[PDB]
């Protein structure tokens, strides 16, 4: 039961570690945001007019 | 049609005003690097890895003596003390080149780390690590006292 | 006589996905001319640039199914390797 | 189309207003090249 | 690179970075070869007995999926393939060492390097870049930028 | 502990009702107790009682505590109680003895008297010579016993001698009893407490000012003042396992040092403050945007990060937003790199 414990331990390092090397992880959806959110005020301040 | 001009004078004006200052701050920031003396990058390796500058210095230099040049810097002859037993205590900050692309540049830290961790886990002084190393390799068996 | 006990077992350290760098941004290029005048071009142009959008979306939609996918079968296989040493724990509970 | 339409435009609006359009590619080759398309529909909405 | 890239589940930095690698070792193989290679098949007609023909493509893709396995084992990032790409790397060899034992080795000190050192690892390789490059090159090359 | 709660100030002066407490003693019994360098054959047996200590023991320490006071012809009963009864205080909460309180404030007791063989001195640091030279700006054979006396390091035994000191009068020093008490002080009050040595120093050193050096002080200085500074461990000790924040967490957050280096993450993150917001003039109505972009970077509010640049355009004044926008608009140019 020991060894079924840190083999349980080792499945939660893996499944976080392909949380943080995952492509559309939270370095993708920062960069998303801070580019999207920039660009649509931008596209408000050419519609409105 | 000369008043809606003056108003694009006073934005070329503004855009010059910051202009200027990005000249000013490109000629500070560009004529300073100077001070590349292949001693800090050690120092960050101190930094990065919990360490210290004197045990992580003397080591380095104790090591590749033999190896590599280790020219010193001038105005600092009583600066840098030198024994056989406890080498290269370092009163200031040290600075020194040692003519690189002659070591291994990823093996020399392996190396590095074990000597550190050798000399922090029997808590020995960085200068006598090599006596055991004279010792083991070379045999001189004067240094067990 | 003495006993002995192990002290401070070393937790892991964290990683993170460095795989992203530096940008290395791609000069455009210069369109010569065209004998069509404005309106014309732009009613294309806006069509043209909806359906970069679309696909924009599209991609990103297949992107994350992908990950996602990914993530699945990785936690499908682990469980079944929990599962089987769970079977040995009560293999061991008969011997009991 | 973009390059297209901003060098029709040149002909009759005058370079002094079209400057900052088409300065900076959209595309991000260290993404898959996300939000692209945004980019050329907020110059071609500045642009008109 | 992109579409090997998302063949697989990669990355297109990692992809660029093991075309490279394998750039100089097995020097038959070239990016250009390869591409060369693809299209003399999937003419007009393709078909299965086309590559099984054409034997280079089922060398190079094979010798692809090898460099795949060692950097999916290793998980290797873009700059640290990028740091064993630079023109003598690890200085035991020259630049993109070949697989054998002792590169797979290498990795896994180079693994606990990253384990050990507690702070965040694009400093490591800066650290470990300035530790092999020459600081003359890189001093010229800021004076440029 | 209802005097530290009700005190609008920093840690608290030693009034002689905080005395009359810890050492057991009556507001009637302090206004008898005057003392001299010897008590007498009355007074001394009343602190040995108040004390859980013998008569001897005490006259060790009112020989030993006026030395280290203001003046040495015996003023201020007060200061010598107060020595007392925190002694008393670290002797409740931990097994600091007679001797090893001595060595901390005055000399290392070097008589060997009628205990069992040997003295406090020749105990701890096992054969040295009280008056000797000591060239310890290199090293010696006594750089041995004195780490197996404090359980210190090489470089931390350095700086350890470079206050106490001076880094002048390192080299030749001839260590009388009082010169081994600058030693044992400054590296006793860590281990005595749950603490290393450098996490001392920087737990001293923190709780400071640009200007001072507190080492200096807290290593050549009188009683109140090295009680002070266990006070002082003891309240941050306190604090910072009362809400689990680390030394590495204090350090990420507290450090002047900022290493150049230009890693790929802020290329990457400051790609977009550019690439999304063109080249501009810094007008008022691109300070929103800008904070909206750097808010989106991370994962923050718009508000918050609209506070903090405002909280840093005050603190380290070469800080500013228009200045970090030139910053950004220098680089990032046609061809941007690393």
């Not at chain 1, 499944?15 to 920039?38: I, P």
């Not at chain 2, 003396?37 to 380095?60: P, V």
């Not at chain 6, 003046?71 to 097994?95: F, T």
């Not at chain 6, 994962?299 to 903090?308: E, F």
Request: glycine share 4%; proline share 3%; with cysteine.
């Amino acid at each position: 039961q020991r060894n079924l414990a840190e083999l349980e331990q080792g499945h939660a390092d893996a499944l976080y570690q392909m949380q943080s090397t995952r492509f559309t992880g939270k370095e993708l959806y920062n960069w998303m945001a801070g580019r999207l959110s920039g660009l649509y005020f931008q596209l408000f301040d050419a519609t409105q007019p | 049609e000369v008043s809606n001009l003056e108003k694009s004078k006073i934005q070329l004006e503004g855009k010059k005003k910051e202009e200027e200052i990005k000249l000013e701050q490109a000629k500070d920031n560009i004529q300073s690097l100077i001070n590349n003396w292949d001693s800090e990058i050690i120092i960050r390796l101190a930094d990065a890895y919990h360490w210290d500058i004197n045990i992580a210095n003397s080591m380095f230099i104790l090591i590749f003596g033999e190896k590599i040049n280790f020219t010193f810097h001038y105005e600092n002859r009583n600066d840098y003390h030198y024994e056989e037993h406890y080498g290269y205590r370092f009163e200031q900050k040290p600075m020194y080149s040692f003519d690189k692309k002659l070591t291994n540049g990823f093996g020399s830290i392996l190396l590095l780390k074990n000597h550190i961790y050798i000399a922090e886990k029997l808590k020995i002084h960085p200068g006598t690590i090599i006596k055991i190393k004279n010792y083991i390799f070379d045999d001189k068996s004067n240094e067990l006292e | 006589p003495l006993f002995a006990t192990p002290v401070d077992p070393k937790a892991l350290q964290r990683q993170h996905g460095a795989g992203n760098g530096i940008n290395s941004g791609e000069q455009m290029a210069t369109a010569q001319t065209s004998l069509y005048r404005f309106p014309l071009l732009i009613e294309r142009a806006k069509s043209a640039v909806s359906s970069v959008i679309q696909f924009g979306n599209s991609l990103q939609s297949v992107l994350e199914r992908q990950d996602n996918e990914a993530m699945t079968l990785l936690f499908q296989q682990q469980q079944q390797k929990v599962l089987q040493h769970t079977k040995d724990i009560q293999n061991n509970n008969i011997q009991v | 189309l973009c390059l297209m339409a901003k060098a029709v435009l040149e002909k009759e609006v005058d370079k002094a207003k079209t400057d900052g359009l088409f300065i900076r590619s959209g595309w991000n080759d260290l993404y898959q090249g996300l939000l692209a398309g945004e980019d050329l529909q907020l110059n071609l909405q500045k642009l008109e | 690179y992109r579409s090997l890239a998302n063949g697989f589940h990669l990355k297109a930095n990692v992809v660029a970075g093991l075309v490279n690698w394998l750039a100089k070792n097995d020097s038959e193989f070239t990016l250009e070869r390869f591409w060369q290679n693809i299209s003399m098949t999937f003419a007009e007609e393709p078909s299965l007995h086309q590559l099984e023909v054409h034997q280079p493509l089922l060398i190079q893709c094979q010798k692809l999926s090898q460099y795949v396995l060692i950097a999916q084992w290793a998980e290797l990032s873009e700059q640290e393939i990028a740091l064993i790409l630079l023109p003598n790397g690890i200085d035991n060899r020259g630049s993109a060492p070949s697989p054998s034992i002792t590169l797979l080795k290498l990795l896994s000190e180079f693994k606990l390097c990253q384990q050990e050192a507690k702070v965040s690892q694009s400093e490591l390789f800066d650290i470990m870049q300035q530790l092999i490059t020459d600081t003359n090159e890189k001093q010229e090359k800021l004076r440029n930028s | 502990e209802i005097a530290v709660l009700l005190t609008e100030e920093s840690d608290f002066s030693p009034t002689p009702a905080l005395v009359q407490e810890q050492l057991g003693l009556n507001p009637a019994s302090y206004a008898l107790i005057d003392i001299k360098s010897p008590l007498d054959e009355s007074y001394a047996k009343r602190l040995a009682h108040a004390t859980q200590l013998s008569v001897e023991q005490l006259q060790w320490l009112n020989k030993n505590a006026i030395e280290n006071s203001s003046n040495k012809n015996d003023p201020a009963k007060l200061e010598i109680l107060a020595v007392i009864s925190e002694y008393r205080r670290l002797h409740q909460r931990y097994g600091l003895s007679v001797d090893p309180f001595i060595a901390i404030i005055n000399a290392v007791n070097t008589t060997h008297t009628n205990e069992n063989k040997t003295s406090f001195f020749q105990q701890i640091f096992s054969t040295l010579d009280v008056d000797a030279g000591f060239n310890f700006l290199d090293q010696g054979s006594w750089e041995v016993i004195i780490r197996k006396a404090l359980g210190i390091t090489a470089e931390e035994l350095l700086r350890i001698a470079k206050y106490c000191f001076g880094k002048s009068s390192i080299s030749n020093v001839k260590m009388n009893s009082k010169k081994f008490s600058q030693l044992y002080r400054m590296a006793m009050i860590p281990r005595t407490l749950g603490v290393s040595f450098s996490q001392a120093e920087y737990l001293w050193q923190l709780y400071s000012h640009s200007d001072e050096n507190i080492m200096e002080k807290i290593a050549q200085g009188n009683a109140l003042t090295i009680i002070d500074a266990i006070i002082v461990l003891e309240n941050t000790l306190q604090w910072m396992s009362e809400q689990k924040l680390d030394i590495t967490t204090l350090q990420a957050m507290l450090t002047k040092q900022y290493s150049t280096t230009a890693t790929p993450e802020l290329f990457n993150f400051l790609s977009n403050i550019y690439q999304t917001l063109g080249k501009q003039v810094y007008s008022e109505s691109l300070k929103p945007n800008l904070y909206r972009s750097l808010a989106n970077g991370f994962h923050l509010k718009a508000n918050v990060v609209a506070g903090l640049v405002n909280w840093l355009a005050k603190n380290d004044s070469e800080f500013t937003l228009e200045r970090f926008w030139q910053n950004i608009s220098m680089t990032f140019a046609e061809e941007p790199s690393l």
